[PDB]
Design a binder for this molecule. Sequence first.
Ligand code: NA
Length: 129
Amino acid sequence: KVFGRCELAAAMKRHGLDNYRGYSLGNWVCAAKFESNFNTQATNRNTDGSTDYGILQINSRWWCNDGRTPGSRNLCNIPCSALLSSDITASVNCAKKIVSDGNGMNAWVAWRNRCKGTDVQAWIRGCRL
Ligand code: NA
């Protein structure tokens, strides 16, 4: 599923991500935009052989099981495929664990490089929320 900007903002708010760990909803929408362009089916293979999955490009090194990332963990206790669903519940639940891990939203390199410090409220501007 390719979400619309305001459609994803609403789904993220419904699942409790708005101001989760002090990150405003525009931060989450901005990260999803640059990680996946709002596509739940987004995948990206890393040089280390891990894979990033879903709207927030969650990595198999630590967070999900894909059966093909040697030495990896599954700290969200999900198959990585769950992160590609039209239903964002698994991505949101796993993102909450990731952003609690100590480095906040820096865990998402695209958020640090393209969202952090910017006017992220522009990402929810005009949305009925
Ligand atoms: Na894994």
